[PDB]
Design a protein around this nucleic acid. Structure first.
Lengths: 198, 99, 60
RNA sequence: CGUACACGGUGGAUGCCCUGGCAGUCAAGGCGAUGAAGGACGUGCUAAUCUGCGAUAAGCGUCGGUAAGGUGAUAUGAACCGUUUAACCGGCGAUUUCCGAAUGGGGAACCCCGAUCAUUAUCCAAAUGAGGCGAACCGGGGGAACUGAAACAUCUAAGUACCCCGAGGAAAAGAAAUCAACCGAGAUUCCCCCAGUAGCGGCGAGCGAACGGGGAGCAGCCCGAGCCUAAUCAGUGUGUGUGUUGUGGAAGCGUCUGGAAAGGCGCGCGAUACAGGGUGACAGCCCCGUACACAAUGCACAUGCUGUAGCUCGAUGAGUAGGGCGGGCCGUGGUACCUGUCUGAAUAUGGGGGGACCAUCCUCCAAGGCUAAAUACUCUGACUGACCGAUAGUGAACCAGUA
């Protein structure tokens, strides 16, 4: 259909855009919890170039273990080494995929074209220097409660929004599901929508 | 911050009104003001609280929350004593806002 | 005595001082004698004084 | 005397808390013959432990910081120190017993000297070196077995476990007698891929590359003579940035509940400052602190500069190439590499290589040498954690590696 963009005055209408991809509310809830989990530590195992010197290391008995830098790894015997059991790649994270992670990235982009969601803002948004101006454009927008949700834009990181509640600025190029939905929710700009198309 | 070199003015305890110089600051957060003391058994002006006991922790134990050093605000407290060799601290002391 | 005083003293003055202080510390040994007149202050200072003069003697 | 309950006890679970652990990340990284690490014994007015020092003994001196209080953990008694500004936190210097590599000799810390090997050598130890330590990384040698093959002698586990020697903060390799999709690529490692392909194998089980391509990082150069000189060598001056650590400082209303609000309700404020802690109960505006800025330390590597100094001609290294005998090792197959015994060439109008041998193309030239860069732990400092919570978590949150 047609996604009504908004001006700085949060005008009723501007241009139009949209994303086509069967949005799945089955594709906007955990993923980033997995991001929230997986992004924080995870002892892989073999992933490391650690090697063995064999005997003759230093005048002393030093078992030829999967050593590296000055401490052993990989070997289940020493910490940070690979787990000796079965079914879990990293630490306490959710095993899984490259496609669903992306499928969620596509599906999420579609979530934007939903009534009870965000709204597209004109490019001029990136101009707003002060933060207070944003709060107003968010008030008249009737989405001030979205501060509990999140925010986004295009070109460069919005210094005026970064301050705002739970705001983790991001650019249309590099946006992760987490950004597209700091909790299956978000908000973007005109140019951003165009850039994200790719 | 609070310094033993600063004169304080009680405001809540039964010692409300008394003026005096701090005698020492403890890591616990209790301050002893010179003047705020108790009367021991053999009538000895030694700081402490009140209840029967044996070996004991001196000091009347005052809370910084109810004391009154400098405190820019509409209060009943008045003047308070305060280093100087710093210079920069003199400027702050000269400002009705800092110290 | 302060470092300033020892430096002003002559080579001989520092020798007569050390010998005199050594004399002090010894009469101070009355600690074991359980004397009352004793005082921990000077007792601990004599060792430093004889040390100061000794160091300055080396500085010379 | 049986059962349930009640009061009290025993016991210590449970709930809550935790000055501890576990895990990850960033930074930083060597110590010693001017005699270290470690240990012993001492040292505080009283002190038994721990810590700090060491007979100038939980301390002395200087500069800077800091700040008016302080005399380590212990908040005791006595006493004392500080404004001739201490306590406390940071550079440099002085002192620095004995043993210990110790090294005169002997010795379970006690008594008398450069011991031993070696180089130079005025052959006098006279001038020097080695002899130890250090968590595990790199290199060079020696080299199993349990086990798998559901037995076992190849094979497999292993080139692992273990033994010996040695370096650095990093090591090894390396400019091609190469590759061999070509009128082509073109130093060497490493990552991905090529491949689980070619190849090996009672071809049984199993074993297992490389060329190339895509990347990271890029640098190429030295030995007989002629000539001459801006590479090198010696010395001088001597940082920026960055990284780590430390440092400067003000401010609190109304109603209700309460012993006290950091509560509930009402009103208001700051924010290049939407970390944390403290304060009589969940305080961003009560105090510290956080932006901000400053200071100290390390970095010190480099750059600049003084005197040195190009370039040219010819050749290019034999018990080797290669062959035979006997072994080791390898994915190496008649086609890997190396050791030992014997034999033994030719030379660029030559020789080697392109996975079989020998005569004819293409490529490249050994038997001499050097060479920056591309990562890897966690002792140490700091940070983080949908980790655990004191029969959990490190054996150790309590004297623990103690009793």
């Amino acid at each position: 259909m047609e996604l009504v963009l908004k001006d700085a005055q949060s005008a009723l209408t501007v241009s139009e855009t949209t994303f086509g991809r069967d949005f799945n509310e089955a594709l906007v809830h955990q993923v980033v919890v997995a991001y929230a989990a997986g992004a924080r530590q995870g002892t892989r195992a073999q992933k490391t170039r650690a090697e063995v010197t064999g005997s003759g290391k230093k005048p002393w008995r030093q078992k030829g273990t999967g050593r590296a830098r000055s401490g052993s790894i990989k070997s289940p015997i020493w910490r940070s080494g690979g787990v000796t059991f079965a079914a879990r790649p990293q630490d306490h994270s959710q095993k899984v995929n490259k496609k669903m992670y992306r499928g969620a990235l596509k599906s999420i982009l579609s979530e934007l074209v939903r009534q009870d969601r965000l709204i597209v803002v004109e490019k001029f948004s990136v101009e707003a220097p002060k933060t207070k101006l944003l709060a107003q454009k968010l008030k008249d927008m009737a989405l001030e409660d979205v501060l509990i949700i999140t925010g986004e834009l295009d070109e460069n990181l919005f210094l005026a929004a970064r301050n705002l509640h739970k705001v983790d600025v991001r650019d249309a190029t590099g946006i992760d599901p987490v950004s597209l939905i700091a909790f299956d929710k978000v908000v973007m700009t005109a140019d951003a929508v165009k850039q994200v198309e790719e | 911050k609070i310094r033993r070199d600063d004169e304080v003015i009680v405001l809540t305890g039964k010692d409300k009104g008394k003026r005096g110089k701090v005698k020492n600051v403890l890591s616990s957060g209790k301050v002893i003001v010179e003047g705020i003391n108790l009367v021991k058994k053999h009538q000895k002006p030694v700081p402490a609280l009140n209840q029967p006991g044996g070996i004991v922790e001196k000091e009347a134990a005052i809370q910084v929350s109810n004391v009154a050093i400098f405190n820019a605000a509409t209060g009943k407290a008045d003047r308070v004593g305060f280093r100087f060799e710093d210079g920069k601290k003199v400027r702050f002391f000269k400002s009705n806002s800092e110290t | 005595m302060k470092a300033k005083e020892l430096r002003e003293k002559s080579v001989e003055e520092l020798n007569t001082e050390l010998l005199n202080l050594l004399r002090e510390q010894f009469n101070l040994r009355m600690q074991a004698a359980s004397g009352q007149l004793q005082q921990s202050h000077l007792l601990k200072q004599v060792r430093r004084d004889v040390a100061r003069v000794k160091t300055l003697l080396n500085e010379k």
